């Protein structure tokens, strides 16, 4: 990838600054120009790419540095001496390797690369291997305990016993009650093929990787330890050592909501987790009596490492941009270019608190963006790679560039679900011009790009708006929205915190108006933490539509200790906020709405829309009702004023709305769900809620050069909300 | 219903005694004769009814008493004085009424029926009503606070203020943040229409009902009830009263796994829950940070009362039966008869521990029976009522008899799911000859009745067996099963405790063989308690096929504190025990199996079964593979030996086996789930497992006078397990 980058934040108010971090491989410098993003959909059948250059606000040329991306999670213990005494060295841990056929995988290691001194314990399909540093002259020593390891809990260790002049490498199954438990060791004579280390042999101790970094580990590690001596007079564990003898012994249960691994010995030899491995997972002791790690961390004393974890690239800031007071709140981007290559770094200039610049405010669903960031869908076939070429779309796609990590909708290489998503990495899926699907009947655009359909329609019809992100709602609460006359959602505000829901709710209770212009909103919960800026956590618990299903008892976030999963499962349904709930789900194709209604309150919104059908067109999916649909905790006075119909047979019910495959939670037949319902109703606080319940809805606004019904409907809503 | 009853236990060993409790609505005595049940399917197209009379082992004639059943749950506080002082009376609670349109419903009362003195606070569609006893002369006083109460938390109270000489009845909505909060009171002059009660005015204080027999059982949650002798507009709560003034103030959070409600004042005026209301449910303070009542009971300080709750009839023992050591372990019952009427009280004679009487043992799924007990299915139409007649089947069915209570597959009258199931009541669904469905192609029999197909086939073909219940597996662990050469399950061992699973697993690990002769086994968890004998708890959590869905955070059992719901959701899948798991679920109809296999291990079982398909016959459903189906955490060496096929389109996938409506947990298509797969495999402990994965399987054993392929298959499995 030629030039790319990312920013430390995605949103800044007046005088807040944004640090942009760029990696270009060109020898020549690059240029950066501030732009306002107007339309990001490169489909030639629609408004096409639209930017207002503001080079006069910020322009720069900058020296190009190529900076790495190194996936794979592990822990580093820095500032310690080389392990080992004249008596020898013992080290071991309790592992559960989840993907042995992926290569050498390092349980723990310490390796002074220059002096060729140190140790490393690895597992592989060939078994358990110890590597010993052998000095500047020869290659390392290697001792192999050959065993066929499964995905089970094994205790693993080695011991260099200068006394008995032997090296021992062994592995025993923890649960001995199984049919054929693994109990295997390899002994070979020591022969002064090892000596007590010297002060210059010191190196960092690593868990989950090897640094001479490679052999990133896949699976759970629990209770690793190092001893300077043999144990007191069958795997040696830390329990077996006088504390004099113990070099370090870590308890992964101490500090679950942090990035620090704690050493329990007086040496206080603590360590820092890299690339955000997954904490708050069951340890060996977990037996199902405790399902919440907050009250029972002994059952959660393990860490799950993945060799494709990626959080915080660590790239140096290439330039910063403080926001002037003269810069209107909106959706901006930094255009980077070298050598014909082009990248955009999107971000948002946020209004001041209580000082709005327009009557409307739009909420960029950055939590939903991030949750989806770099989702390798496996659909970058020759068909789409071609279509991207023809349309002049963003050239690069997460299928082809795995170095940028995964999304919470992918699985890790070991099969476990991706529970984290960093925004501190280039997110290809968030660039202007990124195509998601090979849309046979439109653009095939999602999230950031699709939400620009609404933004270009607002620009065009002359509604001025401010923009705020989800992060902004978290930080300022409902107080930030109250000044605006109406709050507008994106195409898909799927992911939310209790904080963000409260902001929207409180705004309603202040008598605002709410324009829910998407589908499938307010559905999953995310976790965030001050300790880990820039990361979202997502755990798919219980039921619902889910790319993967979380393990029993791992339903509580590690970042913020909250219960994860569907907001339903946290006593907050979509319908309680916007009167419609997630109802049906088919492919990325949209159909048309049927009008019902006009005599009822808010039938005035349908003026200038003729019966009976409308909206059978669209850029996302070819229809204004498609992909994911919201039907009718819904108030009495909910006025349905249009109902989708004529959907593909590929469409289906939302699982969480089902008791059986034959009865919904409402106890009707599931076919009642295959519909989008556009509803209006009055909060009872002096405001109203307008909700389309369809992802593709805003895809139709641009159609017929902004002269159409969908365009008409939305204009009616917004005028109504603005007097 | 003429004669019926129930037994204190369902299983007794040698020298253990069984107490039978009978209610007959006849003047003449009734007669009791011990029979062993051989076949219970009254379908005249098959073996028909079969009993071995044992009048000389136990016979009797006994005095007839007509005994009541009184559903509706509430709390009783016994032996306390009339509440009230010279200063007056205050009483109140925090309620959430879930079914106001059901009548006068009493929040709390104390009423000496004779002296016509006491008080009663009730809610209805008309609002909140106070009733005051006015003496033997006049009618009661009545004061109404007219309000339209919704299903929300309201604080309710009345106050008799002799000082200011006024009566007050009011109700304020707890959540004042809603759009339109209910805040209403009624003040009415007292006019010496009340004076402090006397020593003879004493009566029991009740929560949830009124006693002047008990009536007006309450529907919904009650929290924090209290009574004061003195004064302290917002609602008075117990917090507002000096300890002198407090007559009682109960904390429902104290004692969640018990039947005791505790009073926190020094008066220690405790009370006893009757007919098993639902505890461990969210109270007003619950906010979603705590999901387990064990660590956070202040969030669970509410009790849910239902007016159709039924636990423990309380009937007196009419006769007893101690089990002779001369009595074979098996399935028995007591035949009761008067005036042309007939009832059966089933029970089980248990082998002694380690002293088996046969090589096979069969596990009667009394947990699953109990869970289904008195499931009013709403399907007793004239067609079935007629068919019940023609076949001379058990005359009465729970649709026609609400007095017998409901099942965990029913809803309460207020809409919440039935979460407890008592066995201390007549269970019409456990009577021999009881028909469940109107089977257009078979009998339509389930559980106890259907499981007797196997018992008749075992007797007929000469396999001797002992019988044990789930209680017995609970009581004796795996050590009870160990002596037998093979263990045989029923047609639907759906409901299990951790103990019963461990018994079966440990039996496997002791080198037994296991005959899983049903479908859908090992799916739901039940909760049980020594403190509340005769009761099962079932909470439907997360996903899966479920008659109803439990509330967020109410996932932990109240009886024994365990996490409830699918066993999957506690890390134990059916496939881990029997190699196949619940996969598809359709109507009560069965199709045919196709053989796959003969060379693989255990293909010897297909000897004497010709190709290519087999088993398109049966008493349950007309096919040997039907209703609920188990397909292929499964071992490597799972040898599939047959795969059902050609099921009606009415079949569908089991939800818990789904990630979306298009992808399974295996990421195959859901159409992969529509099948029963019969498998054999070797435990690796010296035993093997044979699993049919179909409820309707044993219905086919009787077909073609016990000579057919299905019957041959089972003989093979059973002889093989006996060498």
Q: In this structure, are residues B543 and B661 in contact, taking their beta carbons and an 8 Å threshold?
A: no
Say which DSSP state A445 is in.
-
- Of B157, B257, B227, B143, the residue nearest B191 (C-alpha): B143
* Judgement on whether residues A113 and A205 belong to the same structural domain of the protein: yes
Nearest chain B CA: its distance from A44 CA (Å)? 32
Domain end point (choices A243, A270, A305): A305
Decide the pairing of beta strands B360-364 and B465-469.
Answer: parallel
Q: In this structure, are residues B232 and B226 in contact, taking their beta carbons and an 8 Å threshold?
A: no
Q: In this structure, are residues A679 and A638 in contact, taking their beta carbons and an 8 Å threshold?
A: yes
Cβ-based interface (< 8 Å): residues of B facing A: 177, 179-180, 288-289, 291-292, 295, 509, 541-543, 545-549, 551-553, 562-563, 568-571, 585, 652-655, 658-662, 665, 683-685
The answer as to whether A23 is a domain residue is: yes
Q: Which of A498, A585, A683 sits opposite B179 (nearest CB)?
A: A683
Q: Minimal Cα distance from B545: which residue of A?
A: A660
Nearest chain A CA: its distance from B284 CA (Å)? 13
Q: In this structure, are residues B468 and B351 in contact, taking their beta carbons and an 8 Å threshold?
A: yes
- Residues of B within 8 A of A585 (CB-CB) are 660-661
The answer as to whether B78 is a domain residue is: yes
Contact at CB, B291 and A289, closer than 8 angstroms: no
* Judgement on whether residues A140 and A237 belong to the same structural domain of the protein: yes
Q: Minimal Cα distance from B584: which residue of A?
A: A661
Q: How many CA atoms lie within 13 A of B545 on its CB side?
A: 17
Q: Which of A542, A547, A570 sits opposite B288 (nearest CB)?
A: A570
DSSP bridge pairs for B20: B7, B319
Q: How far apart are the first and last CA of chain A?
A: 49
Q: How many CA atoms lie within 13 A of A329 on its CB side?
A: 25
The answer as to whether A96 is a domain residue is: yes
Strands (E), B25-165: 30-39, 50-53, 59-62, 74-77, 88-97, 105-112, 117-124, 127-132, 141-145, 154-161
Nearest chain A CA: its distance from B116 CA (Å)? 44
* Judgement on whether residues A249 and A290 belong to the same structural domain of the protein: yes
Question: Collapsing DSSP states into helix, strand and coil, what is residue A107?
Answer: strand
Q: Minimal Cα distance from B560: which residue of A?
A: A289
Q: Residue A333 and residue A51: Cα distance in Å, rounded?
A: 9
- Residues of A within 8 A of B179 (CB-CB) are 509, 683-685
The answer as to whether B66 is a domain residue is: no
Q: Which of B288, B292, B545 sits opposite A571 (nearest CB)?
A: B288
Q: Which of B509, B552, B655 sits opposite A571 (nearest CB)?
A: B552
Q: Residue A147 and residue A181: Cα distance in Å, rounded?
A: 11
Nearest chain A CA: its distance from B561 CA (Å)? 9
The total of structural domains in chain B comes to 1
Q: Residue A348 and residue A423: Cα distance in Å, rounded?
A: 14
Contact at CB, B569 and A552, closer than 8 angstroms: yes
* Judgement on whether residues A34 and A104 belong to the same structural domain of the protein: no
Burial (CB count <10 Å: 0-12, 13-18, 19+), residue A155: buried
Q: Residue B625 and residue B496: Cα distance in Å, rounded?
A: 23
- Residues of A within 8 A of B570 (CB-CB) are 288, 552
Q: Give the contacts of A95 (CB within 8 A, at least 6 positions apart).
A: A107, A123, A153, A154, A155, A156, A219, A220, A221, A222
* Judgement on whether residues A58 and A133 belong to the same structural domain of the protein: no
Q: In this structure, are residues B297 and B252 in contact, taking their beta carbons and an 8 Å threshold?
A: no
Q: Give the contacts of B164 (CB within 8 A, at least 6 positions apart).
A: none
DSSP result, B175-220: -TTSSS--EEEEEEE-TT------GGG---EEES-EE--EE----E
Cβ-based interface (< 8 Å): residues of A facing B: 177, 179-180, 288-289, 291-292, 295, 498, 509, 541-543, 545-549, 551-553, 562-563, 568-571, 585, 650, 652-655, 658-662, 665, 683-685
Tokens of A327: 């810069």
Q: In this structure, are residues A183 and A173 in contact, taking their beta carbons and an 8 Å threshold?
A: yes
The answer as to whether B521 is a domain residue is: no
Question: What ranges in A338-433 are assigned the alpha helix state H?
Answer: 366-372, 382-391
Query: Helices A709-720 and A447-461: crossing angle, nearest 10°?
Result: 70
Contact at CB, B685 and A179, closer than 8 angstroms: yes
User: What size, in residues, is chain B?
Assistant: 723
Q: Which of B541, B545, B552 sits opposite A570 (nearest CB)?
A: B552
Q: Minimal Cα distance from B670: which residue of A?
A: A661
Question: Collapsing DSSP states into helix, strand and coil, what is residue B157?
Answer: strand
Q: Minimal Cα distance from A654: which residue of B?
A: B661
Question: Collapsing DSSP states into helix, strand and coil, what is residue B62?
Answer: strand
Q: In this structure, are residues A82 and A89 in contact, taking their beta carbons and an 8 Å threshold?
A: no
Q: Which of B177, B546, B658 sits opposite A659 (nearest CB)?
A: B546
CA dihedral in degrees (B225, B231, B234, B237; nearest 10)? -20
Question: Sign (positive/negative) of CA torsion B468, B471, B472, B473?
Answer: positive
- Of A612, A578, A590, the residue nearest A700 (C-alpha): A590
Q: In this structure, are residues B430 and B6 in contact, taking their beta carbons and an 8 Å threshold?
A: no
Q: Residue A567 and residue A499: Cα distance in Å, rounded?
A: 12
Q: How far apart are the first and last CA of chain B?
A: 50
DSSP result, B303-368: EEE-TT------PPP-EEEEPPTTS-SEEEEEEEEETTEEEEEEEEEPPBTTB-SSSEEEEE-HHH
- Residues of B within 8 A of A562 (CB-CB) are 289
DSSP result, A628-693: EEEE----TT-EEEEEEE---TT-EE-GGGBSSSS-BTTSS-GGGGS--EEEEEE-SSS-EEEE--
Q: For residue B594, give the H/E element and its range.
A: strand B581-595
Q: Residue B565 and residue B570: Cα distance in Å, rounded?
A: 8
Q: Give the contacts of B543 (CB within 8 A, at least 6 positions apart).
A: A542, A543, A655, B566, B655, B656
CA dihedral in degrees (A606, A611, A612, A616; nearest 10)? -70
* CATH number of the domain enclosing B261: 2.60.120.200
Phi, psi for residue A536 in degrees, rounded to 5: -110, 145
Nearest chain B CA: its distance from A515 CA (Å)? 19
Rounded to whole angstroms, the maximal C-alpha distance in chain A is 96
Phi, psi for residue A152 in degrees, rounded to 5: -140, 170
> Which of B660, B664, B669, B684 has the highest number of chain A CBs within 10 A, making it the mutation to test binding with A?
B660
Q: Residue A166 and residue B610: Cα distance in Å, rounded?
A: 63
- Of B322, B472, B441, the residue nearest B46 (C-alpha): B441
Q: Residue A319 and residue A289: Cα distance in Å, rounded?
A: 52
Q: In this structure, are residues A144 and A186 in contact, taking their beta carbons and an 8 Å threshold?
A: yes
Contact at CB, A547 and B179, closer than 8 angstroms: no
Q: Minimal Cα distance from A546: which residue of B?
A: B659
Q: Which residues of B293-322 are buried (b: 16+ CB within 10 A; e: fewer)?
A: bbebbebbbbbbbbbbbbbbbebeebbebe
* Judgement on whether residues A147 and A193 belong to the same structural domain of the protein: yes
Q: Cis peptide before B454, with omega less than 30 degrees from 0?
A: no
DSSP result, B379-448: ---HHHHHHHHHTT--S--GGG-GGG---TTSBPTTSPBP-EEESSS--GGGSTT---S--TTS----HH
Q: Minimal Cα distance from B683: which residue of A?
A: A179
Q: Residue B717 and residue B513: Cα distance in Å, rounded?
A: 10
Contact at CB, A288 and B570, closer than 8 angstroms: yes
- Residues of A within 8 A of B291 (CB-CB) are 291-292, 563
CA separation, residue A150 to residues A122, A124, A641, B468, B653 (Å): 15, 11, 57, 37, 31
Domain range enclosing A20: 3-66+317-330
Q: Residue A631 and residue B12: Cα distance in Å, rounded?
A: 55
Say which DSSP state B659 is in.
S
CA separation, residue A285 to residues A241, A289, A553, A698 (Å): 21, 11, 13, 51
Report the alpha-carbon angle A129-A135-A141, nearest 5: 20
Q: Residue B698 and residue B681: Cα distance in Å, rounded?
A: 20
Phi, psi for residue A12 in degrees, rounded to 5: -145, 140
| Distinct helix (H) and strand (E) counts, chain B | 7, 42
Q: Minimal Cα distance from A565: which residue of B?
A: B542
Would you tell me how many other CB atoms lie within 10 Å of the CB of residue A385?
Answer: 14
Tokens of A694: 């369809």
Would you tell me how many other CB atoms lie within 10 Å of the CB of residue B217?
Answer: 25
Rounded to whole angstroms, the maximal C-alpha distance in chain B is 96
Question: Sign (positive/negative) of CA torsion B479, B480, B484, B488?
Answer: negative
The answer as to whether B257 is a domain residue is: yes
Burial (CB count <10 Å: 0-12, 13-18, 19+), residue B126: middle
Q: Minimal Cα distance from A635: which residue of B?
A: B179
Q: Residue B75 and residue B260: Cα distance in Å, rounded?
A: 9
Q: Residue B411 and residue B307: Cα distance in Å, rounded?
A: 12
Q: Residue A678 and residue A579: Cα distance in Å, rounded?
A: 10
- Of B445, B716, B465, B464, the residue nearest B607 (C-alpha): B716
* Judgement on whether residues A98 and A34 belong to the same structural domain of the protein: no
**What is the Rg, in whole angstroms, of the alpha carbon atoms belonging to chain A?**
28
- Of A483, A481, A485, A462, the residue nearest A472 (C-alpha): A481
Q: Minimal Cα distance from B151: which residue of A?
A: A633
Question: Sign (positive/negative) of CA torsion A476, A478, A483, A487?
Answer: positive
Q: In this structure, are residues A429 and A436 in contact, taking their beta carbons and an 8 Å threshold?
A: yes
* Judgement on whether residues A87 and A219 belong to the same structural domain of the protein: yes
Q: In this structure, are residues B444 and B436 in contact, taking their beta carbons and an 8 Å threshold?
A: yes
Nearest chain B CA: its distance from A545 CA (Å)? 5
- Residues of B within 8 A of A570 (CB-CB) are 288, 552
Burial (CB count <10 Å: 0-12, 13-18, 19+), residue B607: exposed
Q: Minimal Cα distance from A415: which residue of B?
A: B666
Q: Give the contacts of B636 (CB within 8 A, at least 6 positions apart).
A: none
Nearest chain B CA: its distance from A547 CA (Å)? 7
Phi, psi for residue A603 in degrees, rounded to 5: -65, -25
For chain A, the residues before each gap (C–N > 2.5 Å) are: 212, 233, 596, 632
Q: Minimal Cα distance from B685: which residue of A?
A: A179
Q: Which residues of A670-697 are buried (b: 16+ CB within 10 A; e: fewer)?
A: beebbbbbbbbbbbeeebbbbbbbbbbb
Burial (CB count <10 Å: 0-12, 13-18, 19+), residue A652: buried
CA separation, residue B289 to residues A294, B7, B152 (Å): 11, 43, 20
Contact at CB, B571 and A549, closer than 8 angstroms: no
For chain B, the residues before each gap (C–N > 2.5 Å) are: 212, 232, 596, 632
Q: In this structure, are residues B207 and B74 in contact, taking their beta carbons and an 8 Å threshold?
A: yes
Query: Helices B447-461 and B709-720: crossing angle, nearest 10°?
Result: 70
Q: In this structure, are residues B574 and B582 in contact, taking their beta carbons and an 8 Å threshold?
A: yes
DSSP bridge pairs for B303: B222
The number of C-beta contacts closer than 8 angstroms across A and B is 90
**What is the Rg, in whole angstroms, of the alpha carbon atoms belonging to chain B?**
28
Decide the pairing of beta strands B278-281 and B88-97.
Answer: unpaired
Would you tell me how many other CB atoms lie within 10 Å of the CB of residue B394?
Answer: 21
Contact at CB, B291 and A563, closer than 8 angstroms: yes
B385 alpha carbon, distance to own chain's centre: 25
Q: Which of B543, B661, B684 sits opposite A542 (nearest CB)?
A: B543
The answer as to whether B342 is a domain residue is: no
Q: Which residues of B396-427 are buried (b: 16+ CB within 10 A; e: fewer)?
A: bbbbebebbbbbbbbbbbbebbbbbbbbbbbb
DSSP result, A562-619: -B-EESGGGT--THHHHS-EEEEEEEEEEEEEEE--TTSTTGGGGTT--SSEE----T
Contact at CB, A655 and B547, closer than 8 angstroms: no
Q: Residue B90 and residue B92: Cα distance in Å, rounded?
A: 7
- Of A658, A650, A653, the residue nearest A543 (C-alpha): A658
Q: In this structure, are residues A168 and A186 in contact, taking their beta carbons and an 8 Å threshold?
A: yes
Would you tell me how many other CB atoms lie within 10 Å of the CB of residue B324?
Answer: 11
DSSP result, A167-202: EEEEEEES-TTSSS--EEEEEEE-TTS-----GGG-
Contact at CB, A292 and B288, closer than 8 angstroms: no
Q: In this structure, are residues B240 and B253 in contact, taking their beta carbons and an 8 Å threshold?
A: no
3-state SS track over A260-293: EEEECCCCCCCEEEECCCEEEECCCCCCCCCCCC
User: What size, in residues, is chain A?
Assistant: 723
Tokens of A196: 């007590």
The answer as to whether A621 is a domain residue is: no
Nearest chain A CA: its distance from B452 CA (Å)? 29
């Amino acid at each position: 990838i030629t030039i790319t980058g990312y920013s430390d934040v995605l949103s800044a108010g007046p005088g807040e600054t944004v640090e942009f971090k760029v990696s270009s491989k060109s020898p020549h410098p690059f240029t950066a120009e501030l732009v306002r993003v107007i339309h990001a959909d490169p489909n030639p059948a629609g408004p096409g790419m639209r930017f207002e250059p503001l080079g006069q606000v910020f322009s720069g040329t900058f020296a190009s540095f190529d900076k790495p991306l190194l996936p794979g999670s592990f822990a580093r213990v820095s500032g310690v001496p080389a392990a080992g005494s004249a008596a020898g060295l013992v080290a071991g841990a309790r592992i559960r390797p989840t993907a042995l056929a992926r290569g050498d995988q390092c349980v723990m290691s310490q390796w002074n690369t220059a002096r060729h001194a140190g140790f490393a314990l690895l597992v592989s399909e060939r078994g358990l291997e110890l590597r010993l540093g052998a000095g500047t002259g020869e290659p390392p020593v290697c001792v192999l305990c050959a065993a066929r390891l499964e995905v089970r809990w094994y205790d693993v260790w080695f011991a260099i016993d200068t006394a008995s002049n032997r090296i021992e490498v062994g592995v025993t199954e923890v649960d001995g009650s199984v049919a054929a438990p693994v109990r295997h060791r390899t002994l070979q004579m020591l022969d002064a093929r090892w000596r007590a280390p010297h002060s210059d042999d010191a190196a960092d101790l690593l868990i989950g990787a090897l640094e001479d970094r490679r052999a990133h580990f896949n699976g759970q590690i629990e209770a690793p330890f190092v001893a300077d001596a043999l144990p007191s007079p069958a795997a040696p564990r830390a329990s077996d050592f006088s504390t004099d003898a113990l070099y370090a012994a870590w308890d992964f249960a101490r500090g679950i909501d942090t990035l620090k691994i704690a050493d329990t010995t007086p040496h206080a030899r603590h360590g820092t987790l890299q690339n955000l491995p997954t904490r708050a997972v069951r340890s060996s002791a977990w037996n199902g009596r405790e399902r919440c790690w907050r009250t029972a961390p002994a059952h959660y004393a393990a860490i799950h490492f993945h060799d494709d974890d990626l959080h915080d690239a660590g790239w140096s800031t290439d330039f910063a941009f403080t926001v002037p007071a003269t810069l209107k709140s909106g959706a901006y981007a930094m255009r980077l270019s070298v050598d014909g290559a082009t990248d955009y770094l999107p971000f948002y200039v946020r209004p001041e608190l209580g000082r709005p610049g327009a009557p409307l405010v739009f909420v960029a669903a950055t939590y939903t963006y991030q949750a989806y960031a770099n989702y390798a869908r496996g659909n970058f076939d020759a068909a789409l790679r071609d279509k991207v070429g023809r349309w002049g779309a963003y050239p690069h796609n997460p299928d082809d560039h795995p170095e940028v990590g995964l999304a919470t909708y992918n699985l890790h290489s070991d099969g476990s679900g991706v529970m984290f998503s960093s925004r501190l990495r280039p997110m290809l899926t968030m660039r202007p011009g990124f195509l998601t699907f090979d849309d046979s009947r439109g653009s095939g655009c999602r999230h950031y790009i699709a939400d620009s359909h609404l933004l270009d329609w607002l620009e065009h019809e002359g509604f001025s708006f401010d923009v705020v992100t989800d992060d902004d709602l978290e930080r300022f609460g409902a107080a930030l929205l109250e000044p605006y006359a109406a709050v507008l959602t994106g195409t898909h505000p799927e992911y939310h915190t209790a904080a963000t829901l409260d902001a929207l709710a409180g705004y309603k209770r202040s008598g605002g108006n709410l324009a829910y212009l998407g589908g499938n909103g307010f559905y999953w919960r995310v976790g965030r933490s001050e300790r880990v800026p820039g990361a979202l956590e997502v755990r798919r618990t219980e039921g619902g539509v889910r790319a993967w299903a979380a393990e029993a008892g791992e339903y509580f976030h590690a970042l913020d200790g909250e219960y994860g999963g569907l907001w339903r499962s946290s006593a907050r349904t979509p319908q309680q906020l916007v009167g419609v709930g997630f109802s049906s789900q088919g492919p990325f194709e949209g159909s048309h709405y049927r009008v019902l209604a006009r005599s009822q309150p808010g039938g005035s919104l349908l003026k200038d829309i003729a019966g009976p059908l409308f909206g059978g067109y669209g850029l996302s999916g070819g229809g204004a009702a498609g992909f994911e649909l919201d039907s009718t905790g819904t108030p009495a006075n909910v006025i349905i004023l249009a109902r989708s119909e004529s959907h593909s047979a590929a469409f289906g019910p939302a699982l969480d709305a089902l008791l059986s495959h034959t009865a919904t939670r409402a106890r009707k037949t599931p076919d009642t769900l295959i519909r989008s319902e556009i509803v209006y109703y009055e909060t009872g606080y002096g405001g109203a809620v307008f909700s389309v319940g369809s992802i593709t809805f805003c895809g139709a606004l641009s159609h017929n050069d902004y002269r159409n019904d969908v365009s008409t409907l939305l204009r009616n809503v917004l005028i109504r909300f603005s007097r």
